[PDB]
Amino acid sequence: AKQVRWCAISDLEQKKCNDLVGSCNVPDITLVCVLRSSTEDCMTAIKDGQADAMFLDSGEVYEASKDPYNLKPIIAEPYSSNRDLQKCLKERQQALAKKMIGHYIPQCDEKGNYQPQQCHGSTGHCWCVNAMGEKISGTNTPPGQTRATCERHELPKCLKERQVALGGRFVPQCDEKGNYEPQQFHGSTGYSWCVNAIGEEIAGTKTPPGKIPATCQKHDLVTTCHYAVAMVKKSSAFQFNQLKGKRSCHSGVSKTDGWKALVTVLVEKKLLSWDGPAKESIQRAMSKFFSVSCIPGATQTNLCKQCKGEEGKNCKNSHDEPYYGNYGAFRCLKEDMGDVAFLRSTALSDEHSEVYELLCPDNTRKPLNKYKECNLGTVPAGTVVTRKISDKTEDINNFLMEAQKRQCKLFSSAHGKDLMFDDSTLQLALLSSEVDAFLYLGVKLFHAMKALTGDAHLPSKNKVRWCTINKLEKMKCDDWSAVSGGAIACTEASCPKGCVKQILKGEADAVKLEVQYMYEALMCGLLPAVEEYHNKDDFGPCKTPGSPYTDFGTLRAVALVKKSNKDINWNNIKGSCHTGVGDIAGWVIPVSLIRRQNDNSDIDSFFGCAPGSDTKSNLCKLCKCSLSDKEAYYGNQGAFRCLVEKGDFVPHTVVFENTDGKNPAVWAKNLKSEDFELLCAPVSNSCKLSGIPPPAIVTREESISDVVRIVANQQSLYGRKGFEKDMFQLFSSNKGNNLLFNDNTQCLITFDRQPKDIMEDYFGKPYYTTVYGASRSAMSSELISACTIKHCSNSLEVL
Numbered sequence: 186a187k188q189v190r191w192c193a194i195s196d197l198e199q200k201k202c203n204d205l206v207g208s209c210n211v212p213d214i215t216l217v218c219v220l221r222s223s224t225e226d227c228m229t230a231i232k233d234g235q236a237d238a239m240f241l242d243s244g245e246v247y248e249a250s251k252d253p254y255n256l257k258p259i260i261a262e263p264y265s266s267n268r269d270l271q272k273c274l275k276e277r278q279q280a281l282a283k284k285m286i287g288h289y290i291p292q293c294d295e296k297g298n299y300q301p302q303q304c305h306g307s308t309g310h311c312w313c314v315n316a317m318g319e320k321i322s323g324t325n326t327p328p329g330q331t332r333a334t335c336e337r338h339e340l341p342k343c344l345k346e347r348q349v350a351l352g353g354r355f356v357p358q359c360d361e362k363g364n365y366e367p368q369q370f371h372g373s374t375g376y377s378w379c380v381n382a383i384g385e386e387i388a389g390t391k392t393p394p395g396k397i398p399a400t401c402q403k404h405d406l407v408t409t410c411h412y413a414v415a416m417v418k419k420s421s422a423f424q425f426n427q428l429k430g431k432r433s434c435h436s437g438v439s440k441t442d443g444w445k446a447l448v449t450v451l452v453e454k455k456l457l458s459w460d461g462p463a464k465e466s467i468q469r470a471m472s473k474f475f476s477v478s479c480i481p482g483a484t485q486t487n488l489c490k491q492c493k494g495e496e497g498k499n500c501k502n503s504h505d506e507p508y509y510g511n512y513g514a515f516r517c518l519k520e521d522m523g524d525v526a527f528l529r530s531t532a533l534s535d536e537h538s539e540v541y542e543l544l545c546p547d548n549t550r551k552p553l554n555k556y557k558e559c560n561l562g563t564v565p566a567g568t569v570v571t572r573k574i575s576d577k578t579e580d581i582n583n584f585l586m587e588a589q590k591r592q593c594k595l596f597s598s599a600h601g602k603d604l605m606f607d608d609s610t611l612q613l614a615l616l617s618s619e620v621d622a623f624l625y626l627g628v629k630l631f632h633a634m635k636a637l638t639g640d641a642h643l644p645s646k647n648k649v650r651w652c653t654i655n656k657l658e659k660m661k662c663d664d665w666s667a668v669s670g671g672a673i674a675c676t677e678a679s680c681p682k683g684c685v686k687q688i689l690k691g692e693a694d695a696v697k698l699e700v701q702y703m704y705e706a707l708m709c710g711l712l713p714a715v716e717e718y719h720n721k722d723d724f725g726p727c728k729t730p731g732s733p734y735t736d737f738g739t740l741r742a743v744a745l746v747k748k749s750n751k752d753i754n755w756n757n758i759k760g761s762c763h764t765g766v767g768d769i770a771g772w773v774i775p776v777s778l779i780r781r782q783n784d785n786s787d788i789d790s791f792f793g794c795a796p797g798s799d800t801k802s803n804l805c806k807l808c809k810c811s812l813s814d815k816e817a818y819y820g821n822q823g824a825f826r827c828l829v830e831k832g833d834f835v836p837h838t839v840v841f842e843n844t845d846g847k848n849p850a851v852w853a854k855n856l857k858s859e860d861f862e863l864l865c866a867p868v869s870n871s872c873k874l875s876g877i878p879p880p881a882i883v884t885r886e887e888s889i890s891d892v893v894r895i896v897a898n899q900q901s902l903y904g905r906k907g908f909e910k911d912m913f914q915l916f917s918s919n920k921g922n923n924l925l926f927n928d929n930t931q932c933l934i935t936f937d938r939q940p941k942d943i944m945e946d947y948f949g950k951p952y953y954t955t956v957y958g959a960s961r962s963a964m965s966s967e968l969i970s971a972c973t974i975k976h977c978s979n980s981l982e983v984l
C-alpha cells in the first residue's frame with residue numbers, strides 16, 4: 186500500500202488531480218494531490234520530500250537538475266523512430282494490456298511484422314500499412330465497402346538504392362536492417378561523405394582520398410515533431426527583425442517554446458543586444474527589448490504588466506494566470522494584449538488560419554500549416570521528474586502505467602488543456618535510471634541550455650582536466666596535479682562511461698579508456714589523442730615519436746590447442762573453455778567470429794567453462810562458474826587451467842607465462858611451449874583471430890592539439906625515464922596499481938590519424954568488421970542516443 190503525491194501548480198490542476206483521485210482506481214497506489222502556486226514551488230516541494238513527481242517542459246529540465254532543485258527526468262513520451270525494432274509485436278502487447286473492449290489491436294504475422302492490412306475489429310474499418318505500421322494515405326475503408334488491396338512495403342530505401350546499382354558506380358553501404366550508414370565511401374573514386382537518416386548527403390562533408398574524412402554523426406528519423414513558433418495576427422504588418430518595441434505574450438520564461446528558442450534566434454540574428462550571462466540577465470535584456478509583455482514567471486515588471494492574473498497570481502508560472510501556457514499565450518494574442526505570441530505548434534488549429542499566421546525568423550510571414558518551415562526550432566517532449574535519489578520512481582511508474590492501462594483520463598480535462606501533462610501526450614513510458622538531464626536533452630541541447638543559463642565552461646588551452654574512476658586514481662591524479670605546475674587538474678567519476686559523459690558535458694578534458702568503452706566514445710564524437718604503448722623490448726618510439734614502431738605491445742587473441750596431444754582444428758571446434766564472458770581476448774573476439782560465420786546462437790548450440798554464462802549451460806560446468814578467480818578457471822590463468830584438465834581462447838601471452846616453469850602449482854609447472862599450439866602453427870607464429878587495439882586517451886576534437894602537447898611535455902618531465910621522474914611517476918604509484926594508466930605501459934604515443942574511417946582508424950578493420958560489423962549501429966545505448974541527431978519527418982513513409 187503505497188501513495189504517490191503529485192504536485193499541482195494551479196487550481197485547475199488540483200481539480201483535475203482530484204478528479205483522478207476519484208475516478209482512477211489503481212490497486213495498492215493512492216494518488217494524493219499537493220497544491221502549490223507555481224512550477225518552481227512544486228519543484229521545491231518535490232526537492233523537500235513533500236511531493237513525488239511532476240511534469241516539466243524540456244526547457245525546464247536542465248535547471249531542474251541543478252541546485253536548488255536537483256530533480257531528474259524519469260517518465261517520458263516515447264517517439265517513433267526508424268530504428269524501432271519489432272514494433273508490431275510491442276504495439277500488440279501494449280494494446281492487449283489496456284483493460285478496455287473494442288480498441289484497435291495491431292495485427293501481426295508469424296514473424297512479428299505488420300500484416301499489410303490492418304482492421305479495427307469493433308468498427309469494421311480497414312486500411313493498409315507499411316513496415317512500420319504507418320497507414321498508407323487514403324486506404325482507410327469502412328465496412329460494407331471494397332477494401333484497398335495492400336502491398337507489402339518492407340524494402341528500405343537504402344537496399345533499393347543498392348539494387349539500382351548492381352544491374353547494368355555509387356553502391357552505398359548500409360547498416361543491418363537496411364538503414365543508411367552515416368558515413369559513405371565510394372569504392373571507385375575514393376571519396377567519402379556523411380549522410381542523414383534517409384541517405385541524402387549533408388553539405389560540406391565530402392572528402393577526396395588521402396584527405397581526412399569529416400566526422401559523420403548518427404541520425405535517427407523521427408515522426409510527430411513539435412515546434413516553437415511565433416504566432417501573429419494577419420492584420421499586423423511587422424516582420425521578425427522588427428520585434429523590438431512590440432508587445433509580446435509567452436507561454437513561460439522557462440519554457441523552450443515560450444522563451445529559450447526565441448532568445449537563441451534573437452541572439453543568432455543579432456537582434457538582441459545583450460552581453461554574456463553573469464554580466465547581464467537575459468531577462469533584463471529582453472525587458473529592454475520588448476515594451477510591455479506577459480511572460481509568466483518573469484521578475485521584470487514590464488514583462489508582467491500585460492498579464493491578466495489577479496494580484497497574488499499575476500505573472501505566475503500557474504494556470505491561475507489566464508495567460509500562462511501555450512493556450513494562455515494564444516489567449517493574450519487574441520485579446521489584443523500582445524502583438525505576437527510565442528508558443529508550441531500544438532496550440533495551432535485550422536480554425537485560426539483565417540485570422541492568424543506565423544512570423545518566420547527569415548523576416549517573412551506564412552500560414553499556420555507551414556509551421557515546419559516557419560519555426561524557432563524543435564521542442565522535445567516534456568517529462569515527469571522526481572528527486573535524483575529516485576526513492577519513489579517505482580511507485581510513480583507503476584501508478585502511471587496502471588492508469589494508462591485502465592484508460593484513466595490523464596491527458597484531457599473539462600477544466601482546461603495541458604493541465605497535468607501535455608494534452609498531445611499519447612503515452613508515457615519509463616526511462617532508464619541512467620537518464621539524467623544530459624542524456625534526456627542530448628549533447629547539443631544540453632550545451633545550449635548550459636550556455637543559456639550562464640554555466641558554460643571555456644576550457645583552458647594550457648590545462649588538462651583528467652577524469653578518474655576511483656579514489657586511488659583521484660589520489661594519484663592529485664599527486665600529478667600537485668607536481669604538474671598547473672598543467673593537470675583532477676575530476677572524479679564513478680566509471681569510465683561517466684568520464685566520457687563528463688568530457689561530453691565540458692566538465693572534463695581527457696580520459697584513458699579500454700577497448701570496451703571505445704565504441705561508444707567514438708560514436709559520440711570523441712577521438713584518441715594518445716595511446717598506451719607496451720613494447721618492453723624496443724622503447725624506440727617512446728623517447729622519440731616516430732622512431733618507427735614494429736610492435737605496439739598489442740595483445741593477440743588466439744585459441745590455444747596442442748601439438749597432437751589433441752586433434753582440434755577450427756572446423757570441428759563444435760563439441761574449449763574461456764576466461765570470462767566480458768574478456769575481449771577470448772569471449773568477444775571468438776564469439777563474434779563464430780556467430781558472424783554460420784548464423785547461430787552460440788550460447789549453447791556450438792560447444793560441448795565460460796564464467797558468467799547463465800548457470801550450467803553446456804559449458805560453464807567444465808570448471809561455480811562465477812566471474813571471479815574465486816573459481817579456479819577464471820582469467821588467463823584459469824582459462825589455461827581449462828586447457829590442461831578437460832582439454833580441447835586467450836591472448837598469446839597466456840602460453841608464454843606458465844610455460845617453461847614460470848608458474849609452478851603442479852599443473853602449470855612442468856608445461857612447455859612445445860606441448861601447446863594455436864589454430865589459424867607453432868605457438869609463437871600471424872596465426873591469430875585478431876589483434877586488440879591499445880587503450881586510448883580520448884578527448885574532444887578541439888582539445889586534441891592541446892591534450893597531446895601537454896601530455897608530451899608532462900611525459901618528458903615524469904614517467905618512464907624522465908628528467909624529474911624522482912618527483913613523480915606516470916606509470917606507477919604507491920597509491921595503487923594501474924590507476925590512470927596500465928602500469929606495464931612503456932609510454933604514451935600520439936595517435937596518428939589516417940585518412941581512413943575513425944572507427945577503422947582506431948579499431949583496425951579486422952577488429953571493426955569482426956566485432957561491430959563495420960557498422961555504426963552494432964550497439965545502442967542511452968549515451969549513443971544522446972549523441973544521435975534527431976531528424977524529423979511527417980512519417981517514415983520512405984519504404
Ligand SMILES: NC(=O)OC[C@@H]1N=C(N)N2CCC(O)(O)[C@@]23N=C(N)N[C@@H]13
Binds near residue numbers: 936945948
Ligand atoms: N598496433 C598499433 O600500435 O597500431 C599503430 C597505431 N595504433 C592504432 N591503434 N592504429 C589504429 C589503426 C592503425 O591505422 O593501424 C593505427 N592507426 C593509427 N592512426 N596509428 C596506428
